[PDB]
Amino acid sequence: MEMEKEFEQIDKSGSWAAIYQDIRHEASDFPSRVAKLPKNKNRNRYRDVSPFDHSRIKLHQEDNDYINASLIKMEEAQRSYILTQGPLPNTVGHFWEMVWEQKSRGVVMLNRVMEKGSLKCAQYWPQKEEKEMIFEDTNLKLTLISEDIKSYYTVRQLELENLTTQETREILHFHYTTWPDFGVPESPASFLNFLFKVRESGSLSPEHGPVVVHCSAGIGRSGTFCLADTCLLLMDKRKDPSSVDIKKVLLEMRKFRMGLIQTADQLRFSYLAVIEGAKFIMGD
Ligand SMILES: CC(C)C(=O)N1CCC(Cc2ccccc2)CC1
């Protein structure tokens, strides 16, 4: 059923909470035993948000391979994403180890470091060119190369150096800075513009490792970003765009990480973004 008509029928009937609860009830349940080991308690931001064992990203080291991060692999769309929590004071070195080992080109950040007067993630990148960061636990160096500040987002060029081999790579940091402290944006126009900028960079393309996407827990805003991207790509690839079922795509992505899309308002915003996005992917 054309999703724009499904949209107006849920709005007129006011049934967003009922649709959202049906997704919660049908969602996959897989074990997360590595996440719950006592040695990993200070590697998790939230006790109720864990990566499944089958899809978790492993760090390349014998001591402790654990990070709160999942590989979302979308077979028909031919896109992969890593979804992760905002880094903690003791996991900033793990975070950059993962970017290095997975060959990622881009990091997508959808939160501010402080929101609602509390810290939502560590200051994990350098703010000044001449003040680089060294992560001694994982043997990496990170330098700010340039910064472009726009009204709705900031793009940064970073240099990551593996101090063991003296190899360097360029990482692009895409920082969406205007998601409101409460609720969802009124219009999806700036979020879609932002997604279009990440795509244009090459960060989502198969010649690179998967993009790393985070917010505070790495399930809500992060879920909205990957769901909108995958839905718009499937509308481009298929003979009948109207066959793309956003609820079925979200349940497929929930096989790989729990809890993606945290509220009925986030679900409605995802529909809104895909609908308005479709009006240009179909030729405009
Ligand atoms: C100049 C033009 C090409 C442009 O900037 N956009 C972005 C916003 C909109 C929807 C959209 C579609 C796919 C991925 C992200 C956003 C239409 C295309």
Swiss-Prot record:
GO molecular function: cadherin binding; enzyme binding; ephrin receptor binding; insulin receptor binding; non-membrane spanning protein tyrosine phosphatase activity; protein kinase binding; protein phosphatase 2A binding; protein tyrosine phosphatase activity
The organism of origin for this protein: Homo sapiens
High-level lineage: Eukaryota, Metazoa, Chordata, Craniata, Vertebrata
Transmembrane segments: none
Residues bearing the modification Phosphoserine: 50, 242-243
Residues of the active site: 215 (phosphocysteine intermediate)
Catalytic activity entry: O-phospho-L-tyrosyl-[protein] + H2O = L-tyrosyl-[protein] + phosphate
Binding residues annotated for substrate, in chain numbering: 181, 215-221, 262
Keywords linked to the UniProt accession: Acetylation, Endoplasmic reticulum, Hydrolase, Membrane, Oxidation, Phosphoprotein, Protein phosphatase, S-nitrosylation
Membrane topology summary: Peripheral membrane protein
Modified residues (Cysteine sulfenic acid (-SOH)): 215
Mod. after translation: Oxidized on Cys-215; the Cys-SOH formed in response to redox signaling reacts with the alpha-amido of the following residue to form a sulfenamide cross-link, triggering a conformational change that inhibits substrate binding and activity. The active site can be restored by reduction.
Protein name per Swiss-Prot or TrEMBL: Tyrosine-protein phosphatase non-receptor type 1
A cellular component annotation (GO) from this entry: glutamatergic synapse
Tissues expressing the protein: Expressed in keratinocytes (at protein level).
Cellular localization per UniProt: Endoplasmic reticulum membrane
Shown residues in whole-protein numbering: 1 to 284 of 435
Mutagenesis or variant effect for residue 181 to A: Substrate-trapping mutant
Gene encoding the protein: PTPN1
Family in the record: Belongs to the protein-tyrosine phosphatase family. Non-receptor class 1 subfamily.
